[PDB]
């Protein structure tokens, strides 16, 4: 742990200098912009100075974009591995040599230094023995740029770090330019430097035309990620704590309410819908911190206070009273459910549907330890006093949880609220969690009124058939969040199918006559058993399917973003729950359990049915898949089949790479963008054929008088504005 990390924490502003000479001609550019390290991202605009530029921008981009090292997102486990941050207030020499195939070469000469708020890298360029009919100066160069990773070792000779990387250039023509970078970084302080072991930085760019700017220039949006080494297995001690804490008050919140399960209910609804929505819109500026402290603190009073309404007699002594608690139950809960959400999936970074399975497990055990309170509790004192007891093990988590929880701190986002709910995504989402809720709670006012006039049965006898519910809700949480973390393009599928389910069991819950379906009690212990499967199914990868909806929307990543996501977990929860069971007494006084069954089942059929067409019209993803290659003998001919969705391929290009086992992934054919032009590797030319169907959006390669030396997994590129290959198939010629 550098000095320098402290120093990084938020978005500090960049400026850039470069003076350059390419065979006899100087040129010189420079700009500004603002780059973060909390988690990685760098944006770069680029002005030229002299008015033309002899060169391509992407040239360039490896000095300019490349050049700032420190804006680096490292991960928890390699903050020792991190030598740009190490001395980085005395600033550092990137002195590199650029060397491209069969054109000039380039020597760079950066110094980096921080100046205020304001870091400032002067470079200066040496071009040599470019051709005038090459790619270079001919300026058969696309306007893209691809993603990179770039290797790091250490050096303790100069105490600095040595690199060794090979970029990629996207031809016009189709083919592909190959430029191998060695840089030297040297520190200029006097203070201790961190000498690094081996590790990775991927790179992944995105360039840009300001729309207004007339003189020649370049918006570079840069985002970079570090690895390299294994991670041990081992969790943190920020992971063990948070989880430990997480599972402990959802467990006392299941057990104080095992015990105690028309205009209250309209004033409860309304300010639980309150209290989560303002509450978690404000979760940057008050404190996560103080919010997980906030709101077992509260309720654990409402486990002290319900014990002391015994006391007064009815009237304005105990109704006014009941007014008072709860507003601390629904705010309290209210309070930790969003808090508990917000401090989880930041410990939890690429784990999130996978941890709510556990802690919502956890709380399945609650109601388990329901006759436990009827064990020695109930038997002592009855039901004056056993509610102040188990209320200091509750307010005993205090010092501990005070004391286990981190600290975090993020600056309050500027998107409004709102936008979030203005998506179509988001609208039909809510639909789901306000349908899937109201299915829930119809059944606990209306299941025992069905069994009392039908079977008969003593309501005690009921409560045994809410545990053959949550039997099953315990089990299916953690393995639907098992399989909703490692497929996320399954989690859409996951979700609707869990619905519709949950229409079909509800339809024969309470059969119709139509139906002419005899009930008895083994039928609903069964029918009843696979709504637990259905309900687990759908309730646990709908917050990480909000949370994948807003990134992809052009929200940050963080505290920020989290808390407002998670602040309508809790709200469109409660919008079930009002016009579930007060619109579910209206219904029951229509005609009976026999259609209240049914007609509240269409409403989640009709749930399903309507995000369920919205996202299979219109999905749209880039993914390319490869299929065909086997086992074919030396002389024969193949063919290849690239398949491309999310995009057209009429007007981008494709190319195609091969890997030999062992060996550096190499470059077969391209096509260009007009198809027209096109270009193959110079061992293979004239026995391979490109080909396509623009309209059928496929490419095809055709493969003459096959070697043993072309057996290789082939794959297949495109560029979008960020680059994406294909899956890749194994050629093998024996």
């Known amino acids: 742990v550098s000095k320098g990390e402290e120093l990084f924490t938020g978005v500090v502003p960049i400026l850039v200098e470069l003076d350059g000479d390419v065979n006899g001609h100087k040129f010189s550019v420079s700009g500004e912009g603002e780059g973060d390290a909390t988690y990685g991202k760098l944006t770069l605009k680029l002005i030229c100075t002299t008015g033309k530029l002899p060169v391509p921008w992407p040239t360039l981009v490896t000095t300019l974009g490349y050049g700032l090292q420190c804006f680096a997102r490292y991960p928890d486990h390699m903050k020792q591995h991190d030598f740009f941050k190490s001395a980085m207030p005395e600033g550092y020499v990137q002195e590199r040599t650029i060397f491209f195939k069969d054109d000039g070469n380039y020597k760079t000469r950066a110094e980096v230094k921080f100046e205020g708020d304001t870091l400032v890298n002067r470079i200066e360029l040496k071009g040599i023995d470019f051709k005038e009919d090459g790619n270079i100066l001919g300026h058969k160069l696309e306007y893209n740029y691809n993603s990179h990773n770039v290797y790091i070792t250490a050096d303790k000779q100069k105490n600095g770090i040595k690199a060794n990387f090979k970029i990629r250039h996207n031809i016009e023509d189709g083919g592909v330019q190959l430029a191998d970078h060695y840089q030297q970084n040297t520190p200029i302080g006097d203070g201790p430097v961190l000498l690094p072991d081996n590790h990775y930085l991927s790179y992944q760019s995105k360039l840009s035309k300001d729309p207004n700017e007339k003189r020649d220039h370049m918006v570079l949006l840069e985002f970079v990620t570090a690895a390299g080494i294994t991670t041990p297995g081992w969790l943190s001690r920020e992971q063990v704590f948070v989880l430990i804490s997480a599972a402990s008050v959802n467990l006392g919140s299941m057990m104080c309410y095992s015990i105690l399960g028309g205009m209250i209910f309209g004033c409860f609804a309304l300010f639980e819908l309150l209290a989560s929505l303002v509450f978690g819109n404000y979760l940057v500026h008050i404190g996560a911190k103080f919010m997980f402290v906030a709101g077992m603190f509260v309720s654990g009073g409402v486990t002290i206070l319900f014990g002391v309404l015994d006391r007064v007699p009815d009237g304005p002594v105990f109704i006014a009273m009941c007014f008072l608690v709860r507003v601390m139950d629904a705010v309290s809960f209210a309070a930790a459910m969003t808090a508990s959400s917000s401090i989880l999936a930041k410990a939890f970074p690429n784990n999130v549907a996978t941890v709510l399975g556990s802690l919502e497990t956890f709380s399945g055990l609650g109601l388990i330890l329901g006759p436990p309170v009827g064990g020695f509790l109930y038997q002592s004192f009855g039901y004056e006093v056993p509610f102040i007891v188990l209320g200091c093990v509750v307010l005993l988590m205090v010092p501990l949880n005070m004391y286990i929880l981190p600290n975090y701190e993020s600056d309050p986002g500027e998107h409004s609220f709102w936008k979030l709910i203005a998506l179509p995504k988001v609208g039909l989402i809510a639909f789901v969690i306000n349908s899937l809720s109201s299915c829930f709670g119809f059944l606990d006012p209306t299941l025992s009124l069905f069994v009392l006039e039908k079977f008969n049965l003593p309501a005690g006898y009921v409560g045994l058939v809410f545990l053959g519910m949550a039997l099953s809700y315990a089990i299916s949480s953690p393995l639907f969040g098992l399989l909703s973390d490692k497929r996320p393009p399954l989690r859409k599928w996951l979700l609707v199918f869990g619905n519709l389910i949950t229409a079909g069991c509800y339809m024969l819950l309470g059969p119709v006559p139509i139906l002419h379906i005899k009930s008895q009690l083994w039928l609903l212990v069964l029918i009843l058993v696979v709504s637990g499967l259905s309900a687990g199914m759908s309730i646990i990868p709908t917050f990480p399917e909000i949370l994948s909806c807003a990134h992809e929307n052009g929200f940050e990543e963080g505290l920020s973003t989290l808390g407002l996501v998670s602040g309508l977990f809790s709200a469109m929860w409660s919008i079930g729950a009002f016009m579930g069971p007060t619109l579910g007494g209206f219904l029951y006084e229509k005609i009976g359990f026999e259609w209240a069954a049914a007609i509240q089942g269409l409403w989640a059929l009709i749930s399903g049915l309507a995000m369920g067409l919205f996202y299979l019209l219109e999905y749209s993803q880039v993914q390319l898949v490869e299929s065909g290659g086997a086992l074919v003998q030396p002389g024969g001919s193949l063919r290849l089949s690239c398949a491309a969705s999310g995009f057209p391929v009429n007007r981008y290009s494709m190319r195609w790479y091969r890997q030999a086992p062992g060996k550096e992934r190499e470059w077969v054919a391209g096509?260009?963008?007009?198809?027209?032009?096109?270009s193959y590797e110079d061992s293979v030319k004239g026995r391979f054929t490109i080909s396509r169907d623009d309209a059928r959006n496929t490419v095809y390669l055709q493969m003459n008088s096959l070697k043993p030396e072309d057996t290789a997994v082939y794959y297949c590129?495109?560029?979008?504005?960020?680059?994406?290959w294909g899956q890749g198939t194994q050629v093998t010629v024996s």
């Open positions: 096509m260009s963008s007009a198809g027209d032009r096109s």
């Open positions: 590129n495109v560029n979008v504005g960020f680059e994406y």
